[PDB]
Amino acid sequence: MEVIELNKCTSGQSFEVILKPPSRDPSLEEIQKKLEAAEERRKYQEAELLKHLAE
Amino acid sequence: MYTFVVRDENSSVYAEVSRLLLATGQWKRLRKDNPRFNLMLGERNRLPFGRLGHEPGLVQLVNYYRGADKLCRKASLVKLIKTSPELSESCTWFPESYVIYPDEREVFLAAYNRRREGREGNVWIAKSISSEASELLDFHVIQKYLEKPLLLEPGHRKFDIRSWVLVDHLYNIYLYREGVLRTSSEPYNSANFQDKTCHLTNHCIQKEYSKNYGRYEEGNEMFFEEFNQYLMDALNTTLENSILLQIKHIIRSCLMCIEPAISTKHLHYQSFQLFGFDFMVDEELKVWLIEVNGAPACAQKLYAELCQGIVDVAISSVFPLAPTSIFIKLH
Amino acid sequence: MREIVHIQAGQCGNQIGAKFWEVISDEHGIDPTGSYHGDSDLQLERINVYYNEATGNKYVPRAILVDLEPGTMDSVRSGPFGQIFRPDNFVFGQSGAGNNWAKGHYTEGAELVDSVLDVVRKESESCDCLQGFQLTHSLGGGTGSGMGTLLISKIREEYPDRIMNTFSVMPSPKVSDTVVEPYNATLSVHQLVENTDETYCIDNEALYDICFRTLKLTTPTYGDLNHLVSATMSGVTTCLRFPGQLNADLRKLAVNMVPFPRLHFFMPGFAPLLTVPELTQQMFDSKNMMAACDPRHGRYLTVAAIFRGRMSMKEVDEQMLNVQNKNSSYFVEWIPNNVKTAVCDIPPRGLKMSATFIGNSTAIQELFKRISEQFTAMFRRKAFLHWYTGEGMDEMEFTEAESNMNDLVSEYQQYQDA
Amino acid sequence: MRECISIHVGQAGVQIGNACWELYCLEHGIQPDGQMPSDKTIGGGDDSFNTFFSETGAGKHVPRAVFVDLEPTVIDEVRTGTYRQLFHPEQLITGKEDAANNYARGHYTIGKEIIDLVLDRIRKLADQCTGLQGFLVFHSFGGGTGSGFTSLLMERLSVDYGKKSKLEFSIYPAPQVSTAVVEPYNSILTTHTTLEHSDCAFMVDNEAIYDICRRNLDIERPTYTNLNRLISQIVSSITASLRFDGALNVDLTEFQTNLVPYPRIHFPLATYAPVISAEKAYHEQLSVAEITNACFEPANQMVKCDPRHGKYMACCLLYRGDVVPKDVNAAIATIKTKRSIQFVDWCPTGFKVGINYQPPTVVPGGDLAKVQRAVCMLSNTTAIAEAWARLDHKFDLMYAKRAFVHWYVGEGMEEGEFSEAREDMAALEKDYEEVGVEE
Numbered sequence A: 001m002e003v004i005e006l007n008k009c010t011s012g013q014s015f016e017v018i019l020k021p022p023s024r025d026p027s028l029e030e031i032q033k034k035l036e037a038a039e040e041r042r043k044y045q046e047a048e049l050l051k052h053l054a055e
Numbered sequence B: 001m002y003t004f005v006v007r008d009e010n011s012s013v014y015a016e017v018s019r020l021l022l023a024t025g026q027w028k029r030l031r032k033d034n035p036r037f038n039l040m041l042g043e044r045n046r047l048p049f050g051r052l053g054h055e056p057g058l059v060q061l062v063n064y065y066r067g068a069d070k071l072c073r074k075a076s077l078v079k080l081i082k083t084s085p086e087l088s089e090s091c092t093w094f095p096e097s098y099v100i101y102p103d104e105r106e107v108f109l110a111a112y113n114r115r116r117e118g119r120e121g122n123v124w125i126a127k128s129i130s131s132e133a134s135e136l137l138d139f140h141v142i143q144k145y146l147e148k149p150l151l152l153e154p155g156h157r158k159f160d161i162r163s164w165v166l167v168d169h170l171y172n173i174y175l176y177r178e179g180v181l182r183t184s185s186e187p188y189n190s191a192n193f194q195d196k197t198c199h200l201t202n203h204c205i206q207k208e209y210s211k212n213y214g215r216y217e218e219g220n221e222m223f224f225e226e227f228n229q230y231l232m233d234a235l236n237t238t239l240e241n242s243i244l245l246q247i248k249h250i251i252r253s254c255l256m257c258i259e260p261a262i263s264t265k266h267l268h269y270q271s272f273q274l275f276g277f278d279f280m281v282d283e284e285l286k287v288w289l290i291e292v293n294g295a296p297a298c299a300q301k302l303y304a305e306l307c308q309g310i311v312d313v314a315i316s317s318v319f320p321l322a323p324t325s326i327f328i329k330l331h
Numbered sequence C: 001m002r003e004i005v006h007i008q009a010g011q012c013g014n015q016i017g018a019k020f021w022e023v024i025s026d027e028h029g030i031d032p033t034g035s036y037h038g039d040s041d042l043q044l045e046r047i048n049v050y051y052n053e054a055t056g057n058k059y060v061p062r063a064i065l066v067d068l069e070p071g072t073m074d075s076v077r078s079g080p081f082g083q084i085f086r087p088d089n090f091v092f093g094q095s096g097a098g099n100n101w102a103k104g105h106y107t108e109g110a111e112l113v114d115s116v117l118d119v120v121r122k123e124s125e126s127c128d129c130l131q132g133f134q135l136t137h138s139l140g141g142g143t144g145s146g147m148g149t150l151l152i153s154k155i156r157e158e159y160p161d162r163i164m165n166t167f168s169v170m171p172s173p174k175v176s177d178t179v180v181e182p183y184n185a186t187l188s189v190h191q192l193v194e195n196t197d198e199t200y201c202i203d204n205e206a207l208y209d210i211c212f213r214t215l216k217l218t219t220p221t222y223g224d225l226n227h228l229v230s231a232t233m234s235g236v237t238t239c240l241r242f243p244g245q246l247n248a249d250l251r252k253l254a255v256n257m258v259p260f261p262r263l264h265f266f267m268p269g270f271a272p273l274l275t276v277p278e279l280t281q282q283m284f285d286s287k288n289m290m291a292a293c294d295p296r297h298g299r300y301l302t303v304a305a306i307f308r309g310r311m312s313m314k315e316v317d318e319q320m321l322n323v324q325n326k327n328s329s330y331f332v333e334w335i336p337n338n339v340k341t342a343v344c345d346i347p348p349r350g351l352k353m354s355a356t357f358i359g360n361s362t363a364i365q366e367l368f369k370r371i372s373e374q375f376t377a378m379f380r381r382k383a384f385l386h387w388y389t390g391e392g393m394d395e396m397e398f399t400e401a402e403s404n405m406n407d408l409v410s411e412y413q414q415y416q417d418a
Numbered sequence D: 001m002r003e004c005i006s007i008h009v010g011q012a013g014v015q016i017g018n019a020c021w022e023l024y025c026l027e028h029g030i031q032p033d034g035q036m037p038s039d040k041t042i043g044g045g046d047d048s049f050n051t052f053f054s055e056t057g058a059g060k061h062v063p064r065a066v067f068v069d070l071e072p073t074v075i076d077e078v079r080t081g082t083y084r085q086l087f088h089p090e091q092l093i094t095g096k097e098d099a100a101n102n103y104a105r106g107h108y109t110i111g112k113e114i115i116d117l118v119l120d121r122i123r124k125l126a127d128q129c130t131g132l133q134g135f136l137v138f139h140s141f142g143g144g145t146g147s148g149f150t151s152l153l154m155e156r157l158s159v160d161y162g163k164k165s166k167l168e169f170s171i172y173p174a175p176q177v178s179t180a181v182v183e184p185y186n187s188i189l190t191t192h193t194t195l196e197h198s199d200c201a202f203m204v205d206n207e208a209i210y211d212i213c214r215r216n217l218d219i220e221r222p223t224y225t226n227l228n229r230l231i232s233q234i235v236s237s238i239t240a241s242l243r244f245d246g247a248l249n250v251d252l253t254e255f256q257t258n259l260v261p262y263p264r265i266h267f268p269l270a271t272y273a274p275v276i277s278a279e280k281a282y283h284e285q286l287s288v289a290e291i292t293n294a295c296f297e298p299a300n301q302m303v304k305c306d307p308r309h310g311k312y313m314a315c316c317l318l319y320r321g322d323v324v325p326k327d328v329n330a331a332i333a334t335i336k337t338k339r340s341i342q343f344v345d346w347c348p349t350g351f352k353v354g355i356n357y358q359p360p361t362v363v364p365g366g367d368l369a370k371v372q373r374a375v376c377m378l379s380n381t382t383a384i385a386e387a388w389a390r391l392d393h394k395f396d397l398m399y400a401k402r403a404f405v406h407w408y409v410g411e412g413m414e415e416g417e418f419s420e421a422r423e424d425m426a427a428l429e430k431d432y433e434e435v436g437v438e439e
């Protein structure tokens, strides 16, 4: 049971105890595209509603 | 009104237990996928333990112990005994076993030559029966074959013992006072290991292959009353003294070993389980553990009593309904 | 979302509407003069949902009163809390609708509908954040049914992203005014399936039976019927008016109760018509349903139970689990935790504690099937059709409405076997 | 000294943020007006508490925090609360119309309208940092804003601050603690879109906290205030190393280094002990061994699961109070012989320990009693995948009938995103399995 890396300060201390040894984020553009694509689908469905109500 | 679900249609035991709960009138069977249950009689494989104990205001109990497979699997059991300090290599009631992947490949042969050279009986068995190590490895765990078993007379026949054990949610260990002996009706001959009919006591192979099936006792099943009587008349001893003490010892040893791993004493759900222990006895009246069964079937004669007992000590103890014990408390 | 705009149309709409305002004004501590005299501050925390604040600590209901004849609205103004309403929000004609859907929807109502939308617009324009609208009406008459649904259609056009909520009174031969009620109701429901997010189906048949077979009233009046509705409307809108566990709005209500857009017709319930088990068992009983339907003939998609007053909510949850296990076969398995239990600290007047039921059950198809049968009984012989054809309608529009409700019945039947 | 910016999204995030910053001010001796007498370097300084608090000329200590909600009433309570002076108006951002428990409403519809405002307000806090570490995001899984807007924010943060680390404190949905019926939907959706943008995420199941408050605090019906004050303690334990002098977990990068070997498997299990009711007149103080032993009791975990049937990848012990390394090792040695602790056979079977001599601070008039020693264990175990399993199961039940889907599609979302999100969760469950492998 080993105790490694003991660091003592005036607020406390820390250490490590070994018991057994071992055996492309989306760009700003692409996000804007998704947000605008969903907006168009909303506007499309609303337009279909207003068209229906117009009939 | 308590609610339960049935998720194992093949279970003859819990089919009867299910029948009893309904007969009380205080238990209602829901559809198998209804999560709002008090009691799950779950499936044998891939039981969703992770979904239990997450329903608000619902105390949930299940008929299986998560982790009990370590005791109910051949390879795991051998691995459990050899590695657990509680059981250790100093386990004098479990046959010399070795786990083999198609490991213990070197050690098995290292001990094999220590018996052939010593001219000691070097016959082994492997499943998941030969005297040659080459015939076995070409064919799973390898276990030493008791060449000197206890033989019943008349018949000169070998047998094995089945003990039903119930472990409730409080991890109390109950041994059913009614056990059963499954006997091979063909007389034991050491010389022939090709024919397994006299050497297999298992009913399934016995039911069809035994050319003298049902000769001595019905269904090749002898119960505790007769076997005790035979032991008194033939060997001047009792079933309790000569055999049951070792059986209770082995059961307690195995179940206490895995207790901290499977216990549900402070878990968000509760577990109980019926186990099937299979034993062997040599000519020295010494008991050997064969295997542990996770989903055991009972004997037809003993179905009604045991299944009722399961309700009383494992189910009703958690969910009370609106006097001798058929169990022996081992814990 | 904050502000809700209330609209009441027709005789039934204005009578139940007036009663609803009298009840909640009392609960929020508002007198007929519009002045606040309450003891608690919970009454004023979300009072702006139904009330506008005028200068002088006066609270004026954000309500709009509509009818094609002054008769009922004259009685409202002379009623108890008749002076609390904004005089400019009284919009009425002189002709009447003659219990004719076509008159309210196509001819008489079309002439008046614009001036109503003017009042709606004025109220909406001075809202911090409009939630949507609540409409009270019957489906059996002409104004509330015909013009009411016409109103909803044009409100949706001008406010396509706001929630439309209705308290709709279903007609019944037990409490009937005219024989054309099945025609009027059938035409209205089709409008409701397309143009509302939430409809509280208030069956006059159920209201009558409750007054008769429970409250022991030999000859129930409309006042007796409206007493049950007032209590129900107060209970279902509690989570909107008061701070509580839910603390919800119109959209959040619709989201959690409506798994499929067309299936948004609810069975309300109230108790008592006291012990917690008694209060819980009673609220899930058919005898307490405001829609004459047997819940044990259908399945619950979603359920909301709201408790009022002071009680051990531990004991409630136990009883809620209790009634659920009794009715375990009447809930769907494919919507986990579809039963909501909620509490409000403010009890209604005259009751120490109460409970309100709001269920989305497939059993409500019995209501639409009942209306459909009465519709077909007359329509197969084209009876009383001349009242409608004389207003410009033709038989095809009736056949469509008949089909649409049959489809609605089929849609409820689909999820009853799943 | 490297600064940390905290972001609180939705009702759950904000209300938890309130409890945490209330506790932070009590731990660092900061009065509600922002004045800190013990601090001598007026107007600045690079002390450990400066990681969370910036300073003004009047000796005022301002939390490096941003509260965001698509609805005013919750944050309005902060504007008028006890610590109203603590926050500058620009830190508190409110909308007028929430997401109605709809992920799509929070992410797409309402999200795009306010996302640019949030970033600019965050940018202002970032510009006041000499060396920004990263972000601590507080939100719920179930809420429309907490799920919808958070995932959108996490994407933009990865764009504008690609080098910085991002940690999550996420509230897992529990039917007993005020849930919407569609919260399983929102949980799966937000996890799938946030998964590659979060370096480490601490899940807190409301169910676990609820039962702990009932069992240990004798509160029959725990309120959000009860739950949040307990959660704040766990949060405080985790962030203590960033706010106080120490050597373990000194920066956000170390959390990933010490707890997360595989990037996708970044959900450490948190276990806290002890929790004692303040109403309890006669209480006996628990020892090091006792509180350390409790770290392996499921009833003390932030998420209910069984670590005995999984495998550890990492374990961190965070002690506060009268604790010495000697007693820790003796406790661990005893535990390894009684408990079932199995590590993966490609990781060092060990424990990284951190001790802070200052005992846990409790809110005056709170439900928690003041103890002399407490411990928070952070263990990355495959057992936490159980929580994903039950969550995904509820998803599958509703989605089979496409229930409530129209509410999401109506906001511009597609059915494809549902299946896309679920498959990733299916892959995530599979990742955990690969790691923690009649008769």
Ligand SMILES: Nc1nc2c(ncn2[C@@H]2O[C@H](COP(=O)(O)OP(=O)(O)OP(=O)(O)O)[C@@H](O)[C@H]2O)c(=O)[nH]1
Residues within 6 Å of the ligand: D009, D010, D011, D012, D013, D015, D016, D069, D070, D098, D099, D100, D101, D102, D106, D140, D141, D142, D143, D144, D145, D146, D147, D171, D172, D173, D174, D177, D178, D179, D180, D183, D206, D224, D227, D228, D231
């Ligand atoms: N622990 C804790 N959980 C909370 C708190 N507030 C809400 N929750 C949980 O968060 C989930 C709902 O998310 P909310 O944060 O309330 O909703 P939101 O993020 O504001 O998004 P909206 O739908 O727009 O309101 C529920 O499962 C609640 O249990 C809180 O103060 N403390």
Ligand SMILES: N#CCCNc1nonc1-c1nc2ccccc2n1CC(=O)c1ccc(N)cc1
Residues within 6 Å of the ligand: C235, C236, C237, C239, C245, C246, C247, C248, C249, C252, C253, C256, C257, C302, C303, C304, C306, C337, C338, C339, C340, C342, C358, D101, D177, D178, D179, D180, D181
């Ligand atoms: N708790 C909390 C807040 C979020 N839950 C919702 N917010 O409003 N309604 C909600 C909600 N959740 C649900 C889960 C199952 C069944 C119904 C549910 N409801 C709907 C509900 O509570 C309600 C209450 C009063 C009504 N007149 C109509 C509906």
Ligand SMILES: Nc1nc2c(ncn2[C@@H]2O[C@H](COP(=O)(O)OP(=O)(O)O)[C@@H](O)[C@H]2O)c(=O)[nH]1
Residues within 6 Å of the ligand: C009, C010, C011, C012, C013, C015, C016, C097, C098, C099, C100, C138, C139, C140, C141, C142, C143, C144, C145, C169, C170, C171, C172, C175, C176, C177, C181, C204, C207, C222, C223, C225, C226, C229
């Ligand atoms: N519950 C209830 N139902 C009513 C009331 N008044 C009328 N009704 C019902 O409403 C239908 C008549 O519609 P009504 O509102 O009177 O005609 P409208 O003025 O054109 O809307 C009939 O089926 C009545 O049973 C009332 O005060 N309470």
Ligand SMILES: Nc1ncnc2c1ncn2[C@@H]1O[C@H](COP(=O)(O)OP(=O)(O)O)[C@@H](O)[C@H]1O
Residues within 6 Å of the ligand: B095, B125, B127, B128, B143, B144, B145, B146, B147, B159, B160, B199, B200, B201, B202, B278, B280, B290, B291
């Ligand atoms: N060590 C042994 N010595 C002698 N016979 C044995 C031994 N182990 C098992 N058997 C015999 O094998 C039969 C059951 O063996 P078992 O390993 O349980 O088969 P299976 O693995 O197919 O269940 C019993 O009838 C028993 O007599």
Ligand SMILES: [Ca+2]
Residues within 6 Å of the ligand: C111
């Ligand atoms: Ca005219």
Ligand SMILES: [Ca+2]
Residues within 6 Å of the ligand: D039, D040, D041, D042, D043, D044, D045, D047, D055
């Ligand atoms: Ca300073």
Ligand SMILES: [Ca+2]
Residues within 6 Å of the ligand: A025, D158, D162, D196, D197
């Ligand atoms: Ca990144």
Ligand SMILES: [Cl-]
Residues within 6 Å of the ligand: D160, D161, D162, D163, D164
């Ligand atoms: Cl960067």
Ligand SMILES: [Mg+2]
Residues within 6 Å of the ligand: C011, C099, C141
């Ligand atoms: Mg009339």
Ligand SMILES: [Mg+2]
Residues within 6 Å of the ligand: C011, C177
């Ligand atoms: Mg009339």
Ligand SMILES: [Mg+2]
Residues within 6 Å of the ligand: D010, D011, D071, D098, D143, D145
């Ligand atoms: Mg919110």
